[PDB]
């Protein structure tokens, strides 16, 4: 993997501490040939959590159901075969359609307004 990135299951990951809304976070990843990260297993979830410091900082990941409620998509076009929703989540309301991880005391996923500023996780295949 390139310098500051970390490898896991054929992909490289990076924690971007900069506070950005979802769209800016995705744009920031694209500048590096990446996408906000998709997560497909508890093993991957744990690996990414280890990139967010001892505080497990709330972070944007690349999933949303912003087009049609309840229809979730990852920006890297991989399948939605895993989720780590907090209790009662997701709300599926189009007004809070971007996935945020490391949310609350449970450090789980919560769909939230995409305009909120958060750190983020970027990922891209290993070359
Ligand atoms: Ca929510």
Residue numbers in the entry: 4 to 130
From the manuscript:
Many species of ectothermic animals, plants, and microbes living in cold environments produce antifreeze proteins/polypeptides (AFPs) to protect them from freezing damage. AFPs can also inhibit ice recrystallization, of which the large ice crystals grow with the expense of smaller ones, thus prevent cell damages during freeze-thaw cycles. It is generally accepted that AFPs function through adsorption of their flat ice-binding surfaces onto particular planes of ice crystals and prevent or inhibit further ice growth. Type II AFPs are 14–24 kDa cysteine-rich proteins, which have been found in five fish species, including herring (Clupea harengus), rainbow smelt (Osmerus mordax), Japanese smelt (Hypomesus nipponensis), sea raven (Hemitripterus americanus) and longsnout poacher (Brachyopsis rostratus). They are the largest globular fish AFPs known to date, which are homologous to the C-type (Ca2+-dependent) lectin-like domains (CTLDs). Homology modeling and NMR studies on type II AFPs indicated that these proteins share the same characteristic fold, which includes disulfide bridges, α-helices and β-sheets, as well as a large proportion of coil structure. Both herring and two smelt AFPs depend on Ca2+ for their antifreeze activity, while the functions of sea raven and longsnout poacher AFPs are Ca2+ independent.
